[PDB]
Structures are given as structure tokens and as C-alpha cells.
Design an enzyme around this catalytic site. Structure first.
Site, PDB file in Angstrom:
ATOM      1  N   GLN A  19      -6.462   5.406  -0.560  1.00 32.81           N
ATOM      2  CA  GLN A  19      -7.004   5.503  -1.918  1.00 32.81           C
ATOM      3  C   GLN A  19      -8.385   6.179  -1.948  1.00 32.81           C
ATOM      4  OE1 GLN A  19      -6.767   1.078  -2.122  1.00 32.81           O
ATOM      5  NE2 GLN A  19      -8.812   1.180  -3.024  1.00 32.81           N
ATOM      6  N   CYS A  25      -6.416   0.514  -5.789  1.00 33.53           N
ATOM      7  CA  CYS A  25      -5.388  -0.171  -5.021  1.00 33.53           C
ATOM      8  C   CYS A  25      -4.175  -0.505  -5.924  1.00 33.53           C
ATOM      9  CB  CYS A  25      -5.907  -1.458  -4.429  1.00 33.53           C
ATOM     10  SG  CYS A  25      -6.601  -2.584  -5.698  1.00 33.53           S
ATOM     11  N   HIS A 162      -7.538  -7.677  -4.376  1.00 34.28           N
ATOM     12  CA  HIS A 162      -6.907  -6.473  -3.820  1.00 34.28           C
ATOM     13  C   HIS A 162      -5.387  -6.514  -4.109  1.00 34.28           C
ATOM     14  CE1 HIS A 162      -6.383  -2.948  -1.454  1.00 34.28           C
ATOM     15  NE2 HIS A 162      -5.876  -3.527  -0.377  1.00 34.28           N
ATOM     16  N   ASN A 182      -0.423  -1.308   2.961  1.00 37.84           N
ATOM     17  CA  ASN A 182      -1.759  -1.159   2.366  1.00 37.84           C
ATOM     18  C   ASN A 182      -1.957   0.307   2.014  1.00 37.84           C
ATOM     19  OD1 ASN A 182      -4.289  -1.895   1.449  1.00 37.84           O
ATOM     20  ND2 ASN A 182      -4.955  -2.828   3.407  1.00 37.84           N
TER      21      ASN A 182
END
Ligand SMILES: *C(#N)C1=NC([N][C]2[C][C][C][C][C]2)=C2N=[C]N([C][C]N3[C][C]N([C])[C][C]3)C2=N1
Length: 215
Positions: A19, A25, A162, A182
Site C-alpha cells: 500500500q 489497508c 488494520h 497483508n
């Protein structure tokens, strides 16, 4: 529902992204779940546009954070989301661009998994596909994770800061885990992924803000 499920092996997960210098996120978590459904319905695996969401989900805060449910509602009401090729990621909020061309994917809304229920989350991952989830990623132990099934007593179920993507679940040397994608690049964690403790009392709030798009 099976004991183990890993959508990376079926080809339902796109490469790990970064990102960059933006707190998007939530956009990456949302596109990851839409990519899974698109693949399921058509057979093609394509990178969808987090930038499209960052720039246009006005109910969210661009690089300052946002919710995945809002992103799924925007795609539904807007009649689709662009591909990464049509609306590239630049890592900062810009004005919402309109591409007259066709959208690459569509959705008919979304579903929320009942709060704190890891068993419902497991069933949804098995039957539906990758699911968007939020967690507490404030701990140094999470940030510098490298291997094993991640578990930390200090993790706070009520401090969700997150958003990531659950692409499977399984067991490693006796420990049940969740396979998490992730968006901090491939150099983070284990090739960009992390295994998080499963069925250890909703550790890190994993089943507290989970949702998936209806396609
Ligand atoms: C990402 N990146 C990101 N997400 C959020 N918020 C969402 C987390 C998951 C549930 C829905 C809301 C962010 N909010 C703020 N920021 C910027 C970075 N954070 C600033 C505050 N500190 C305490 C933690 C990091 C987000 N980034």
C-alpha cells in the site's frame, strides 16, 4: 467444512501488494475479496483497483482509513470497480476518475459475519472464498512476525486498527491458524503472509469486523 482450506493453491489469490505511503489497508482488503469472487465466477484472476476505492468511496477517508463494508456498497451502487490496469495505484488520494469503459467486476452487496464468531468465519471462508477482516496490528510482535502461528496475549480484540484478507485456515504442528494476506509487500512477514492463531478466543479481534461481497 474441511479441516484445511488454502485459496492460494487453487489460484484464487493475486500477488501480494504494497500500500506504500498511504493508510489504504481497507482498500486492499476489499479488492482481495472481490478478486476471489471474480475468479470463482469466471475463472480469471485479475488485479482490481484499490485506487478506484481510495479516490471514490467518499464515505471513507482515503489514505486516512476506511471500512470494507462501505467499499462493497460503493461498488454495488456504482455498477462495478475498475481493474488495476485501468485505474492504477498511485498511493495518495486524487479526484475520483470516471472510466467510460466497462468495469472489471461487480457485486450485489455484502454480508457481515456475526461478531466474534470464528466458527462462522471458518464456514464462510470454506463456502464463499477469501474474507475481508480487521485486526489489532499495533504490537511489535505482529509487525516483526517472521514465522510460526502468531499469538500474543497483549493483542487487543477491541482495538481494530488494520485490515487484511483471510485466504484460508489450517493447522501447523498442532496449532490451528488463519492464513492472512497483508498489503505491506512481499518482504514483510513470510512472503507477505502471516499465520494467526485460530480458535484462541478471537485473538486480535479477527472475527470482529469480517465481511464478504455477494457476487
Ligand atoms: C490501514 N492501513 C489503515 N486502516 C485504518 N482504519 C481501519 C482499520 C480496520 C477497520 C476499519 C478502519 C486506519 N485508521 C487510521 N490509519 C492510519 C494509520 N494508523 C493511525 C493511528 N495509529 C494509532 C495506528 C495507525 C489507518 N490505516
Amino acid at each position: 467444512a474441511p479441516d484445511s482450506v488454502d485459496y492460494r493453491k487453487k489460484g484464487y489469490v493475486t500477488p501480494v501488494k504494497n500500500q506504500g505511503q498511504c493508510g489504504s489497508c481497507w482498500a486492499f482488503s476489499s479488492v482481495g475479496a472481490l478478486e476471489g469472487q471474480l475468479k470463482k465466477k469466471t475463472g480469471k484472476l485479475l488485479n482490481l483497483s484499490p485506487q478506484n476505492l481510495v479516490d471514490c468511496v467518499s464515505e471513507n477517508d482515503g489514505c486516512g482509513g476506511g471500512y470494507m463494508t462501505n467499499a462493497f456498497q460503493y461498488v454495488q451502487k456504482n455498477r462495478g470497480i475498475d481493474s488495476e490496469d485501468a485505474y492504477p495505484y498511485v498511493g495518495q488520494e486524487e479526484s475520483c476518475m470516471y472510466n467510460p469503459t466497462g468495469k472489471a467486476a461487480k457485486c450485489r452487496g455484502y454480508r457481515e459475519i456475526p461478531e466474534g464468531n470464528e466458527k462462522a468465519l471458518k464456514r464462510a471462508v470454506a463456502r464463499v472464498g477469501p474474507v475481508s477482516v480487521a485486526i489489532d496490528a499495533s504490537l511489535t510482535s505482529f509487525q516483526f512476525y517472521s514465522k510460526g502461528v502468531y499469538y500474543d496475549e497483549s493483542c487487543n480484540s477491541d482495538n481494530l486498527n488494520h485490515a487484511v484478507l483471510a485466504v484460508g485456515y489450517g493447522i501447523q504442528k498442532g496449532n490451528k491458524h488463519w492464513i492472512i494476506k497483508n498489503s505491506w509487500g512481499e518482504n514483510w512477514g513470510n512472503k507477505g503472509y502471516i499465520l494467526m492463531a485460530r480458535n484462541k478466543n478471537n485473538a486480535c479481534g479477527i472475527a470482529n469486523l469480517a465481511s464478504f461481497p455477494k457476487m
